Amino acid sequence: SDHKFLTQAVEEAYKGVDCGDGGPFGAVIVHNNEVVASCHNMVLKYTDPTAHAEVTAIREACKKLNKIELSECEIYASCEPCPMCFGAIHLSRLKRLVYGAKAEAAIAIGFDDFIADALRGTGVYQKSSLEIKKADGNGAAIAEQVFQNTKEKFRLY
Amino acid sequence: SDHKFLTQAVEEAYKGVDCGDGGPFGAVIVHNNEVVASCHNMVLKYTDPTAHAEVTAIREACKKLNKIELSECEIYASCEPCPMCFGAIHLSRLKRLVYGAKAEAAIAIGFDDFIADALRGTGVYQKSSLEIKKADGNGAAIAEQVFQNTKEKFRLY
Ligand SMILES: Nc1nc2c(ccn2[C@@H]2O[C@H](CO)[C@@H](O)[C@H]2O)c(=O)[nH]1
Ligand SMILES: Nc1nc2c(ccn2[C@@H]2O[C@H](CO)[C@@H](O)[C@H]2O)c(=O)[nH]1
Ligand SMILES: [Zn+2]
Ligand SMILES: [Zn+2]
């Protein structure tokens, strides 16, 4: 299950950067093997710096399920969520997070050095008990390659 | 001028609580001395856990100014911005944050212990260069009083 939805998030990243909606980031929210939302970064399309892939997916999934908590759902992110997105995941009560590429893969092509302490367990005040899985193997390699692959199709923001 | 805009953010908090839009939190974004956005928590109204007051104000200000960066604006928050909102403030490039009440005042009436390390200066992977001002005196008194005045006037989230 993890490989399928992670690859869906990666394909979302490619599609979003290809049509100019935003950067090469995707996110898929799933409810017991049923996809609730499949989104990508929409910062450029929406003129909204908060419209990262994870935030957009949370908004769509909550609107669909008519509830402000997604405690029965899991989220798959093509790239390690930023501090804003990890905070949104925390507030959404999503029960599990799977992400493909480390934030350094995005930093390597010029993105901001902007990493969530609560995700990496380096905070004094912010903690997380959320189940976090960093993908390994084939899906992880594919997810990491997204940034070297799409460096040319968009411009940093 | 700081007291006027902080008090407007507090007024937004009270308004949002009174009409059931969300919790007792407000945010106002100003360009010099002109209000660009005046918002409160819309989590309940929008069925959107990301629709905190600060995120809402950032979205509305970015729409008003037709751009994804607010480097010439400042933000006033009735309460210390959470990790998600502080991440959004970082991404929006707002040049100054003034906040009224410490997060402990909100936690003391039922909200989660959910504090941004980067705001308090304890972040390792997230570092802010933003100018941050915690309100004192009358502004702090007003902002802290928000939570005693609105206790059990709203649904917790
Ligand atoms: N996962 C994820 N990351 C995203 C975005 C958008 C930008 N970024 C940047 O990526 C770097 C480290 O994550 C930071 O500079 C972030 O601002 C997204 O939509 N999803
Ligand atoms: N500033 C601000 N805070 C908000 C909200 C909504 C909830 N909260 C909670 O308040 C506590 C302290 O920040 C945290 O648990 C947050 O989740 C908001 O709209 N604006
Ligand atoms: Zn993000
Ligand atoms: Zn917040």
Alpha-carbon distance of B54 to A65, in angstroms, equals 24
Instruction: Test A68 with B122 for CB contact under 8 angstroms.
Output: no
Q: Which of B44, B49, B83 sits opposite A92 (nearest CB)?
A: B49
B74 is catalytic: no
Q: Which long-range contacts (CB under 8 A, 24 or more apart) does B125-129 make?
A: B125/A115, B125/A116, B125/A117, B125/A120, B125/A122, B126/A83, B126/A114, B126/A115, B126/A116, B126/A117, B126/B87, B126/B90, B128/B86, B128/B90
Domain parsing of chain B, residue ranges: 1-150
| DSSP per position, B112-131 | -----HHHHT--SS----SE
**Contact present, B52 and B85 (Cβ < 8 Å):** yes
Catalytic residue (one of B12, B34, B54, B104): B54
Q: Please calculate the CA angle A54-A16-A81 and round it to the nearest 5 degrees.
A: 25
Alpha-carbon distance of B56 to B58, in angstroms, equals 5
Token pair belonging to B14: 């009270």
Residues 6+ apart with CB under 8 A from B55: A50, B84, B85, B88
**Contact present, B147 and B105 (Cβ < 8 Å):** yes
Alpha-carbon distance of B157 to B151, in angstroms, equals 13
Ligand 1 probe mutation, A10, A12, A14, A25, most atoms within 8 A of CB: A25
Helix (H) or strand (E) holding B98, with range, is strand B96-101
Token pair belonging to B96: 């100054």
Residues 6+ apart with CB under 8 A from B62: A47, A48, A49, B68, B69, B70, B92
Token pair belonging to B3: 């007291």
Alpha-carbon distance of A114 to A90, in angstroms, equals 17
Residue of B nearest to A86 (CA): B84
The closest-lying atom of ligand 2 relative to the alpha carbon of residue B41 is: 19
Q: Which residues pair with B134 in a beta bridge?
A: B99
Alpha-carbon distance of A8 to A16, in angstroms, equals 12
Alpha-carbon distance of B147 to B156, in angstroms, equals 12
CB neighbourhood size of A8 (10 A):
18
Q: Which long-range contacts (CB under 8 A, 24 or more apart) does A133-137 make?
A: A133/A2, A133/A96, A133/A97, A133/A98, A133/A99, A134/A80, A134/A99, A134/A102, A135/A2, A135/A6, A135/A98, A135/A99, A135/A100
Instruction: Test B124 with A125 for CB contact under 8 angstroms.
Output: no
Closest CA to B35 of B11, B17, B19: B11
Closest CA to B87 of B111, B112, B54, B48: B54
CA distances from A49 to A97, A118, A141, B155 (A): 22, 21, 28, 28
The closest-lying atom of ligand 1 relative to the alpha carbon of residue A81 is: 1
Structural determination approach: X-ray
Give the distance from residue A91's alpha carbon to the nearest chain B alpha carbon, in angstroms: 6
The class that CATH gives domain B1-150 is: alpha beta
Phi-psi map region of A88: left, alpha, beta (phi>0 left; psi -120 to 50 alpha): alpha
**What dihedral angle (degrees, nearest 10) is formed by the CA atoms of B5, B6, B11, B15?**
100
Alpha-carbon distance of B12 to B38, in angstroms, equals 7
Question: Token pair 């729409």 is at which residue?
Answer: B63
Q: Which long-range contacts (CB under 8 A, 24 or more apart) does A127-131 make?
A: A128/A86, A128/A90, A130/A89, A130/A90, A130/A94, A130/A95, A130/A96, A130/A97, A131/A95, A131/A96, A131/A97
Q: Where are the alpha helices (DSSP H) in B49-116?
A: 53-65, 83-92, 103-107
Closest CA to B69 of B37, B93, B53: B93
- For chain A, helix (H) and strand (E) counts, in that order, are 7, 5
Token pair belonging to B18: 């009174």
Q: Is B19 annotated as a binding residue?
A: no
Longest dimension (CA), chain A: 40
Amino acid at A140: A
Longest dimension (CA), chain B: 39
Give the distance from residue A87's alpha carbon to the nearest chain B alpha carbon, in angstroms: 4
- For chain B, helix (H) and strand (E) counts, in that order, are 7, 5
Strand runs labelled E in chain A: 26-31, 34-40, 74-79, 96-101, 131-134
Count of CA atoms in the C-beta half-sphere (13 A) of B33:
4
Q: Show me where chain B is broken: residue before each gap, C-N > 2.5 A.
A: none
Residues 6+ apart with CB under 8 A from A154: A17, A20, A22, A23, A24
Amino acid at B89: I
Closest CA to B78 of B123, B152, B156, B141: B141
